[PDB]
Design a protein around this ligand. Sequence first.
Ligand SMILES: [Mg+2]
Ligand SMILES: [Mg+2]
Ligand SMILES: [Mg+2]
Lengths: 514, 517, 503
Amino acid sequence: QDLVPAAVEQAVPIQPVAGAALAAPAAGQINQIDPWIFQNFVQCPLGEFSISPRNTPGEILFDLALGPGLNPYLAHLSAMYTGWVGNMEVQLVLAGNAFTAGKVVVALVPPYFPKGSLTTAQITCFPHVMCDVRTLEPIQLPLLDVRRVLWHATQDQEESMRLVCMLYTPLRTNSPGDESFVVSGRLLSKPAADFNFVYLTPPIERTIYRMVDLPVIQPRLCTHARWPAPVYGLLVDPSLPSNPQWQNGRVHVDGTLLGTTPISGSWVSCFAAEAAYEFQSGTGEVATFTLIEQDGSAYVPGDRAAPLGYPDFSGQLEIEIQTETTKTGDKLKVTTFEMILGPTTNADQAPYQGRVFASVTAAASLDLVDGRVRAVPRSIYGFQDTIPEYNDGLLVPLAPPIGPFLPGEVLLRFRTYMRQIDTADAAAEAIDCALPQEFVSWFASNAFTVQSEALLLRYRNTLTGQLLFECKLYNEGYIALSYSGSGPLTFPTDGIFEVVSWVPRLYQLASVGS
Amino acid sequence: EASGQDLVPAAVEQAVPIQPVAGAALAAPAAGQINQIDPWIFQNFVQCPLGEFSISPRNTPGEILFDLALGPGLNPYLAHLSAMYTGWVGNMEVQLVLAGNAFTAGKVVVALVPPYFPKGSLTTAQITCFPHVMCDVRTLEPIQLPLLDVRRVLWHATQDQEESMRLVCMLYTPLRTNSPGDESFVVSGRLLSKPAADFNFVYLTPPIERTIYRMVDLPVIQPRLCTHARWPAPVYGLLVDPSLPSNPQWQNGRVHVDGTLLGTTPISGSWVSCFAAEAAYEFQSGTGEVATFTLIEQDGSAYVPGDRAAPLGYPDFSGQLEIEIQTETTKTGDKLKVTTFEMILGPTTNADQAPYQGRVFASVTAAASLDLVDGRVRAVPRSIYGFQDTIPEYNDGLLVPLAPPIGPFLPGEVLLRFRTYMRQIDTADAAAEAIDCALPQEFVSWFASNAFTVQSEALLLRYRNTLTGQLLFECKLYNEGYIALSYSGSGPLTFPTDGIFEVVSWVPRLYQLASVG
Amino acid sequence: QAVPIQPVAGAALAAPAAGQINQIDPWIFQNFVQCPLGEFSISPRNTPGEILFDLALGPGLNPYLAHLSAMYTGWVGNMEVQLVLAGNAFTAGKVVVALVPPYFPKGSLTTAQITCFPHVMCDVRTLEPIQLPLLDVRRVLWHATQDQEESMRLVCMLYTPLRTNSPGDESFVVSGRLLSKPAADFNFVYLTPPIERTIYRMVDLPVIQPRLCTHARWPAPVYGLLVDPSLPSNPQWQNGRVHVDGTLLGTTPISGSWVSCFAAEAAYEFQSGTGEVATFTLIEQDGSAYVPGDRAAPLGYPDFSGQLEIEIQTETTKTGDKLKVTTFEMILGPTTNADQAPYQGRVFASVTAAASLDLVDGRVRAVPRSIYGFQDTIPEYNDGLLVPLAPPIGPFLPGEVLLRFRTYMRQIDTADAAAEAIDCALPQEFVSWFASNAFTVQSEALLLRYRNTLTGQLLFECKLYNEGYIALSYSGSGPLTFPTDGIFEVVSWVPRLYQLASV
Ligand SMILES: [Mg+2]
Ligand SMILES: [Mg+2]
Ligand SMILES: [Mg+2]
């Protein structure tokens, strides 16, 4: 005769996994870590998520892989080792309330289980813990090294054990009351008794598990990335188009440039070519340009739409070039030519094929010598923020349009002003970019590894450390804010962007408002 | 024990030159669970899921009779259990049955081929360079062989297919018979297996029924209660006929066994030989009233010339088709009706019809103007005039992408045909009009919605009678979606249409069937 | 000898799950053989931090183990190496040899980082060979032979500079050489039928004299073999461009019956100018379609400028004159102002016709007959636009000059009498040989020797690069020719910075 209790605590039953006892006969060395790293839970580099009443049951809230990039001490230490082996421990804290109903499941998913779409029925067939959003204290699970190899390489990230969290039952509030309410979650970890490193190497600085940082410069000392001018403004505007297809100033956070984006800010909306002048009788002397790369290399039609640094807007542009004449009384001068960029055919512009056309009006036939030039913009006429002609009328390789966003998110814009010709309006013609120069470099100089889908940034006052807003910076290189206003909203331009954490894609920012 | 030896009892001990391999004990300190298989599964030999093969006097030395890879899919208990684990490891045991008639002669070789050896020819010169055994086709007792887990990992993933050891069987000398009368015997081999002592699985996983094992299964429906896949009608007959063209090039009703649709095959049997288009009407002094249709897809979306010859469900035959259309009129007293046009399908030697590009013209006889309003239509057939079973004119004289013709077959093999009849006009004929397909429409839905994983080249089916539980014949279903029987007669031969098809085994393309009938 | 490292197990860890453990001939354990790419020179002008050699563990380090590797599936175990330096008592300087593990990220190292591995430091005045272990640090139980995986490397750097005197005529280098053999714990895994197409298989050339070959840019024999340094040093030809591993570059064809020709579906009509004009809609010379992709024109299309004659067979439904061969006149020259676009698939040519000679429209194949006003310059592939090309031949080290295979054309020249030369980089037998053998590439270049077969006296040595051009070390100011009845033979893989000897 026996008594079965209704209330039992909760636990995960395990079979022990061997670490360095399997690895040691074919490792070079087996290296120990400081014994007090085994004593403290420390927040994970990806250690923030949220829960809303807009999430639906089945959604995945976080997803973590075993290994050294879960602890900031272990990630600092991996710069001087070639491999790793052993077990870990994770801790979870939820900041909910008394009005909040809901459950989540945290499952342990092994390597080589096909990463498709899990359902709510299936998540409880793994080892798991059942948690609800009203808990005051933290929950912990083990994370074991179930594997087919003898050890792992710190610089190639292969298959390991994962930690998946799913929303089990919907999240509800009793009185309507709180539907703008978000639950915060945080993740923390330490290593368990049986974790080692493998082979001592020189400490390399540009390893993986090195954390991203931004350059410490205020946005008003910087340089616009689509037109050769400083940065003057910083704002967000729902009235404008949401998914622009700009082609300069676009870079991945892992460091790969895309579009015609150059490294230097002295290539921006400028070009270089071989020159050839003729004097068709009607208008004037006409210059046909055979395009090259600005470092003097040849141009080959490839996977961009033009050479690096080409203007990505429409309208009539003014250039200044050097000219060497064959008259009497002059040998060198800065000449002006007038050029049309937009979809304004009858001129047959095809910078994708390596030929552009321009002209200056002249009652003479000034014999200008053929050679090599560098053209720089002077003024713009009828500027539309739309792509120019790249082929004659044909489509070219492009970079995808900016996006996607979540419901409620909008795009952050850096603004500058262009020199223009205008007759009736004396307003300042504005142009935006997503990331300024000083940011497209510092990427592609550093080559970071993205470790998640977005980066959470805080923007502060350099003095008094006040918080101005929070934002998501996605891997593709654009920033989002949570903002549901209708008109514009501009921000002070002398702050500094911080780095907080890697976050998931479904992360819910706090809303900004005028 | 048996009457009359006249032959070899056992290909028993030949030594195989190989070392003992370690199984689930190298993997155990790297899992975080203790797992285990039912001790009674280790206690009897059961037929393998790819477990049948033939040897005929038509085969030549160097042909591969079977080629098995080590893993869960060699046993039916183990292929069921692998749906709820990640990982496997260990050795197996196999049994070979080859007990031909005492009047036969021949040899085969079975080799142990390691991981990472190229897949390709395997000439008869290099198969004996492996650890191998040589076998007579007359051996009475079953021959037993080891299949060992030579590997440089600690275990294997169940939902991958990795490098493991293989077991390859090749015909070594031809098969002959010195019996005085009229025919040479075929040998019927079987493969059986069971796990060895240290086979295990690794980590428990949600049981997911769409795994890479899980053999195909057909729907339990009778042929005479299915829907034709080239004409909108029931299925009525089922027969073979060696007098009709052998390798047709039908475009509708084609589907891969793994779920890929071929040609212009739709999913709904309500799209077969219909179309949806944007219409425009005119009245003139000549043809009468011409209707011009620009085609879209039938759900309602646009059409673009692509990897097919026409939209989905377009009729793949020649003739003159009359259709029926809903139309409006700008007359008073009459609102909406059903009107009938006709349309020629063939080349016509001068035409304005390119259904590849989306251009189709119809017409109706009319003395005055029949003012019919424009809009959206869906055309269905009513009758066929001058039926020809040859492809229509897709692009007037071009070469559009087409699904290949049905074939090849082995010597002696003919095509199984599903038959229905059409509505027609005929002056001097009173017989029906027959159209044939390869698989009926329920089988296209089954394969498109199931996404199976094939094993070798064909499936072996048997056809059973429902009223008496009798097996009538056996056929081969090739992975490209056509069925073949073995028949060497001249007259058509028909079959009842109140039976079921049932899957038996995976087979090679050189499998030889018993003939009907 | 003693570095800070633990002993590594070979067959004790592989044997449970291998099928066989196979032994090697005991006399192979008694000889140190030269490793491939194990040798350097140190000069007084070298800068500390520069890399002397870089070698990975496996069967390819030994010539006997690379042969034996073709009848096996795997390998395991450790090796041992010797380093031999040639200095004397009146030198100074140092080197460091490090043991770098399997997954270290490749890049570049400094002298500060090289001492952070397990290493030895060695003085250039050392007398005996310096002996070391090369161990199998690994995450698997054995390695597959028809595969290359990560293994331990051995890396040598110059640590402090060389200090010496020199005479007036030469300049005193210190030389080094690395030799190897297997350690007692080294084995193979499972006996397989021997393979001929293995990854440890050396490049070889066809045994054919240059004068019996076929020219790669004009359909005719090869008549010369020269080196001329007054010509354009970096040409950009588009035919006869092949990679040593067998990839065809440019518009290079496999067969010599395609060089400087084209096939097309022709269309004719009379114009009251020169006469019957032909619109050639180009096709691939084997009957398949043509789509503008990676290269400038279809395969084999000529790649020089001028005005060219072409012969085509016509059919005329005239009763009394049906089939005949008619020579047209195409002008594919430089910037010669008529809308020629091979890259899109259409060209034009016509003939002086007094009347409208009936010529039906059908399939044709053009062959050249003679050239008029020939320049060595890219044709007009697209009207005035740019086209996907192949990079210019190069680059060459200081002193290096391109070797040229020369032949002669069919000229039209009214006020000249000397014949027209034209060059290529390789004949048409070295092109299809690389395309059929599909070799595996090891360093950057191969060292060849041009020898005479009658006596056995070598004419020079050259450097066949991976992209497919030859380079000799030359200093003279005029063309220097060679006899066209020698034989090219392969010596070894060399690095790019390898200094040949003079000609
Ligand atoms: Mg303005
Ligand atoms: Mg009839
Ligand atoms: Mg000449």
